[PDB]
Structure 1
Amino acid sequence: HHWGYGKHNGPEHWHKDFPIAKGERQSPVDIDTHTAKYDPSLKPLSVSYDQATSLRILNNGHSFQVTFDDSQDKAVLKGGPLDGTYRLLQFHFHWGSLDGQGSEHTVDKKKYAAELHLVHWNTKYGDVGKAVQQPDGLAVLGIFLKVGSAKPGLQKVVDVLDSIKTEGKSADFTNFDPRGLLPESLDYWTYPGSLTTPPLAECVTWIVLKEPISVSSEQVLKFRKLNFNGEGEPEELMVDNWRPAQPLKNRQIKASFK
């Protein structure tokens, strides 16, 4: 029906409502590290998050998201494979029922426990609705999560998830600094792809960082207590909200590093 991640509405059904699901530049993909070409012409990623203004945290029935003020150039991505300036709209995660799955991208078929997406849109298109209709409209910065040591910068997020358990719930989430979610290295892979949920628009320049962040078992367990369902409905844990790897087709994954 309305799409989700279950047996009857999950990724293998999405093509019926969104035929671009079987398109030529779908995401995510497996990153085959030995086949990705080092591109010495790729520039360092420019991440400018000092003036970020977070606004709200929301359970959208498919993930939770932290939304930012994107009405000015306060939190922007540029350089790397990008032409121009991309404003941060929101970040969200994909995660598993257990630590051995949850990421959308894979690395030599390895699945991480979770994947963080920082979603940015190209200011030349003026708004994100316009940007998703363009092949260079969005840049999504993808960061893998493994389970081990706690990520201190994630704790303010984990501590409010009890307040947005079910679909539709939101809360004030001001003064959150997304720099606390970044790994040391900005070494990346890049390829042209898509949104990984409906409507699966082929509008994304993917930038996937090589270095995962570590989060604790206690932090990821709080993700797994969220609910896909709305408040009065049968409880269906929000887990395994990831789309599997899609055919690479006529695409090259480029590495910023040797």
Structure 2
Amino acid sequence: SHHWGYGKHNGPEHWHKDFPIAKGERQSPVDIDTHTAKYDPSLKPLSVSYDQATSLRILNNGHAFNVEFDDSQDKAVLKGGPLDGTYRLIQFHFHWGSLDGQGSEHTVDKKKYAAELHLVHWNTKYGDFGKAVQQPDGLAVLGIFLKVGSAKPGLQKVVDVLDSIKTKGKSADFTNFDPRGLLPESLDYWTYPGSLTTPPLLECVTWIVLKEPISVSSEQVLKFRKLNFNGEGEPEELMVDNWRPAQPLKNRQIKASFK
């Protein structure tokens, strides 16, 4: 990691040299063993309130693409469930595979989905994202699995802008995108305490992983796979397999919101 990435020489097995927390006590993702996960009656109802979300821009950062939100006001927020207080949406992104049989970060009884959507939120008690990532309860990431089947209509606007952000460092205006169109019907979830799944791997995250996947079409995920990890005018390296494998569960319990 000389810069970190997803290749043989810079990928997840190397991250620990620059980021020793990679071998920490609460790393993500994990495998979700559905039989061992326990219903938790202490969880409150989950509230995903995205009606006033204001997207701004879409960016290829060289590892994935981020759809960024204006988080300067109390707008798109996550609350309830395992969370204490209010968490504000700052960005979402995906992780995906070279083939439909892999791509997710979390696994469910060892099953890998084709991709995984991460809606990233910071705890408003800490003022900003940067202060939030110095806290054990600074972030909440809502994770949603993607399987290949029917198209997700609400994803198409993302897909259709990807040609403008092919390479690392490119961005495009991306206003008026409604992340409600990326959610499944059910909010049933699993939750556990973990980390960022990319460097700096900080152990700040309450993970909330929905049980119900969304379906996206083969054509939609094929367009993800046309993105590039490299920058413009550099040798093409397709942006595929940008997922970290499951990490040791260590001294954690995964709780279920459902019976």
TM-score, normalisation: structure 1: 1.00
Deviation per residue, 1:192-250 (Å, 9 max, x gap): 00000000000000000000000000000000000000001110000000000000000
Once the 2 structures are TM-superposed, how far is the Cα of residue 127 of structure 1 from its aligned partner?
0.6
Once the 2 structures are TM-superposed, how far is the Cα of residue 104 of structure 1 from its aligned partner?
0.1
Which sections of structure 1, spanning at least 5 residues, go unmatched?
Answer: none
**DSSP-derived class of the 2:58 partner:** strand
CA distance in 1, matches of 2:235, 2:53: 37
CA distance in 2, matches of 1:30, 1:87: 26
Which sections of structure 2, spanning at least 5 residues, go unmatched?
Answer: none
CA distance in 2, matches of 1:40, 1:22: 31
**DSSP-derived class of the 1:175 partner:** coil
Once the 2 structures are TM-superposed, how far is the Cα of residue 120 of structure 1 from its aligned partner?
0.1
Deviation per residue, 1:46-105 (Å, 9 max, x gap): 001000000000000000010000001110000010000000000000000000000000
The reply on whether 1:216 has 2:208 as its aligned counterpart is no
Deviation per residue, 1:88-134 (Å, 9 max, x gap): 00000000000000000000000000000000000000010110110
CA distance in 2, matches of 1:21, 1:35: 24
Identity of aligned residues (%): 97
Deviation per residue, 1:28-59 (Å, 9 max, x gap): 00000000011112112100100000000000
How many correspondences in the alignment?
A: 258
CA distance in 2, matches of 1:45, 1:100: 30
**DSSP-derived class of the 1:134 partner:** coil
CA distance in 1, matches of 2:134, 2:190: 23
CA distance in 2, matches of 1:44, 1:211: 17
The reply on whether 1:124 has 2:125 as its aligned counterpart is yes
2:181 match: 180
The answer to whether the Cα contact below 8 Å between 1:59 and 1:65 also exists between their aligned partners in 2 is: yes
Once the 2 structures are TM-superposed, how far is the Cα of residue 16 of structure 1 from its aligned partner?
0.3
CA distance in 2, matches of 1:125, 1:40: 28
CA distance in 2, matches of 1:43, 1:84: 12
Q: After TM superposition, what 4+ stretches of structure 1 lie above 2 angstroms from structure 2?
A: none
Once the 2 structures are TM-superposed, how far is the Cα of residue 172 of structure 1 from its aligned partner?
0.4
Q: CA RMSD in A?
A: 0.3
The answer to whether the Cα contact below 8 Å between 1:44 and 1:186 also exists between their aligned partners in 2 is: no
1:61 match: 62
CA distance in 1, matches of 2:250, 2:229: 32
